[PDB]
Structures are given as C-alpha cells and as structure tokens.
Design a protein around this ligand. Sequence first.
Ligand SMILES: [Zn+2]
Ligand SMILES: [Zn+2]
Ligand SMILES: [Zn+2]
Ligand SMILES: [Zn+2]
Ligand SMILES: [Zn+2]
Ligand SMILES: [Zn+2]
Ligand SMILES: [Zn+2]
Ligand SMILES: [Zn+2]
Ligand SMILES: [Zn+2]
Length: 127
Amino acid sequence: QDPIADMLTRIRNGQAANKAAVTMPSSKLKVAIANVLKEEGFIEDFKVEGDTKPELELTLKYFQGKAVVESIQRVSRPGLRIYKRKDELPKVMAGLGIAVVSTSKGVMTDRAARQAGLGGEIICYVA
RNA sequence: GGACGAUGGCGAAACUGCAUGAGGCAAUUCAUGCAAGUCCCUCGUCC
Ligand SMILES: [Zn+2]
Ligand SMILES: [Zn+2]
Ligand SMILES: [Zn+2]
Ligand SMILES: [Zn+2]
Ligand SMILES: [Zn+2]
Ligand SMILES: [Zn+2]
Ligand SMILES: [Zn+2]
Ligand SMILES: [Zn+2]
Ligand SMILES: [Zn+2]
C-alpha cells in the first residue's frame, strides 16, 4: 500500500539496530530518494542487484557510534497527499533538515527545488 | 497572504489519477500516452 514508508521504516529500524545495510524491493522512486539521501550525507551508498527482483541495498551511516539519520518521517502518503508551491516549501528554519520533494524535474531536496523555482509533493523529512 | 474568475497558456511531467500494454497475469514492478490532481507562469477582480 505504501512502499515509501517501508523504505523509511527500514532505514529507521536499521539505524536503531546498528545494521550496516538494509535491503528491499527496488523502485525508480526509491532509487530517486536513495540518491538524494546520499548526496546529503544520510547514507554511505545504495546499489541495485538482480533483474527479475531488483533488490535495493542501502549502506547506512554512522558517526563514530551514532546513527546519522536522527529522524525520518513520511509527510505525503496515499491517504493524505501533501503538496507545496515553491514559496510554501520549508523556508530555512530546521537547521539540517532536508525535505525530499518530487517535482516535475525530478526528486530533489527542498533547497534544490527552491533554486529551480518549483514546488511539488513532499515525500518526507530527514534530519 | 487569503477567496475566486480569463478563450487562461500551445508551459513542466517526478509523483497521483485515467487509458493501453508487459510482467506465476496475486506485484512493494515496468513501458507508452493524457494532462484532471500537482507544480510553473500570465491577465483580471474581490477582502
Ligand atoms: Zn496548497
Ligand atoms: Zn504564493
Ligand atoms: Zn498577495
Ligand atoms: Zn492570492
Ligand atoms: Zn485556470
Ligand atoms: Zn507534454
Ligand atoms: Zn493496468
Ligand atoms: Zn508507476
Ligand atoms: Zn508515467
């Protein structure tokens, strides 16, 4: 029903149990999210394995004994879709939070969207 | 900022939705297309 929550739950859980990696069925959206999470220091790497069932492998990150991801939350969900115009996006108040946004030019951070002059669906918050 | 209206635009297409197709035809899936949702932008009014 909500394949993104599984991603986020899996990350959340992985980091609570100090698992070095978590793996899950892939999608193009998941890979897009994994890509942003990487650019922004939240995971070490992601990769995709096999063809029939693509598994997505995320390598979690630890800062000398901690989890780098302090909280990862769904915002938009099938059930309650959340969208923001460019001007409505986070305005720089959470001081390390990124919102992950799906825009008509791809999945990017709330900062990158602001810079492109786009709003979009808010997939999650990570901090 | 908020509440609407233009023949709105020869606008974008990631996501949602719709439609077709493919996948033990149960997909946590994928391809093409549309452009209603969603986003950008223009004119006008109204608090
Ligand atoms: Zn809105
Ligand atoms: Zn505005
Ligand atoms: Zn105004
Ligand atoms: Zn207004
Ligand atoms: Zn209109
Ligand atoms: Zn088009
Ligand atoms: Zn179908
Ligand atoms: Zn799809
Ligand atoms: Zn599509």
